[PDB]
């Protein structure tokens, strides 16, 4: 039967980028033609593979990651990028194989009084590895004196809220991202086009 890409794309609620969702897709026939030629995507970029080639390829597992970020930040969901998102929230490898798909979700994810449910990690000691997920909410120590879980000077809550309002500039409006990763092991493939 068919791979369930719709449960990822058509989902009514999306994850925050720091707690990005991953759906592991296995043991199914993937119909990329219908998936791609569907909604209108403001961003569609593939690396190491053509979108029109996926129907001929077989993979051991396929990963579909999804989250929400700012408009100005979509450029960071790409190989070899840096910034608050790529460093501290969601990181693709330099040799990334797969596709990044983004579309404006201002009608669904912004609120008149500001949507503060979507967050991104603002402070972190070091950068994330590729495909690493950090859901910690420990107070960030920006100075010498420890925090002991109490916010204060040099002691910051690690996550910040976007506050999406429906009439912000497009650079500040929420965008829904889906990232398709294609895992090729030396094992029998379970996903073919």
């Amino acid at each position, epitope marked *: 039967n068919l791979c369930p890409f719709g449960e990822v794309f058509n989902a009514t609620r999306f994850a925050s980028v720091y707690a990005w969702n991953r759906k592991r897709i296995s043991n199914c026939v993937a119909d990329y033609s219908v998936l791609y030629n569907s909604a209108s995507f403001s961003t569609f*970029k*593939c690396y*190491g*593979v*053509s979108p*029109t080639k996926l129907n001929d390829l077989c993979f051991t597992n396929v990963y579909a990651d999804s989250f929400v970020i700012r408009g100005d930040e979509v450029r960071q969901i790409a*190989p*070899g990028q840096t910034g608050k998102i790529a460093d501290y929230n969601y990181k693709l490898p330099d*040799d990334f194989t797969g596709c990044v798909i983004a579309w404006n979700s201002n009608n669904l994810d912004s609120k008149v009084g500001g949507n503060y449910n979507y967050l991104y990690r603002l402070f972190r000691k070091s950068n994330l590895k590729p495909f690493e997920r950090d859901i910690s909410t420990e107070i960030y120590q920006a100075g010498s004196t420890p925090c002991n879980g109490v916010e204060g000077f040099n002691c910051y809550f690690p996550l910040q809220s976007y506050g999406f309002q429906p009439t912000n500039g497009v650079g500040y409006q929420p965008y829904r991202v889906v990232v398709l990763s294609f895992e090729l092991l030396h094992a029998p493939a379970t996903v073919c086009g």
Partner: antibody
Amino acid sequence: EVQLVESGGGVVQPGRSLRLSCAASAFTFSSYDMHWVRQAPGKGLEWVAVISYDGSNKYYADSVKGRFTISRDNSKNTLYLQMNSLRAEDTAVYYCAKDGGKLWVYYFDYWGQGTLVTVSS
Amino acid sequence: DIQMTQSPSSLSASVGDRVTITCRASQSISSYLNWYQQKPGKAPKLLIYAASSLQSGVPSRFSGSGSGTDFTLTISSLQPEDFATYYCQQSYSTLALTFGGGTKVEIKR
């Protein structure tokens, strides 16, 4: 022995439309992805658009997106490029190109001879 | 976007010389790097695909090497008909295919 023959180029005014065609021969046309690439006079090569083997998936460069349209008739073995709202920067020689299918990624193994499009009043 | 920088822009070499052209990428493009030859007035022709694979029918005096960000096209023995402008083109970013500036090869006699 793979041939690609272009036609339809000519003179066109700014804001008008034009349609280029590319007839393919001697290979399984309805199973390869097809590209359009253009080259303004004296300048380099610029990828324009690609279409899937079955004509379902289409992708364009940012410089012509929402402005050009690519299509294909597999029963006629012909590739099409529909160009609307033509600006002065669109003046170029337009090539069609077969993919190659030996890689996971796009490349251009066979090219058409190109047809000239001059946007002018 | 990924920019492809070709050097040199132009070169003079005589028949029988070893010619080498360098193409650099603004970021790692794995091995998806292709070389094209375009005679004056003619359509480009594929010489090398995937950094070092020889396209069928291309003469043996053509070859390529490189990985990551630095790639090379080599003509081991320049022939008179090898006068053309030579382009590299990256295929790692498949929906934003970009070409290099081109290297014009001129025959010295």
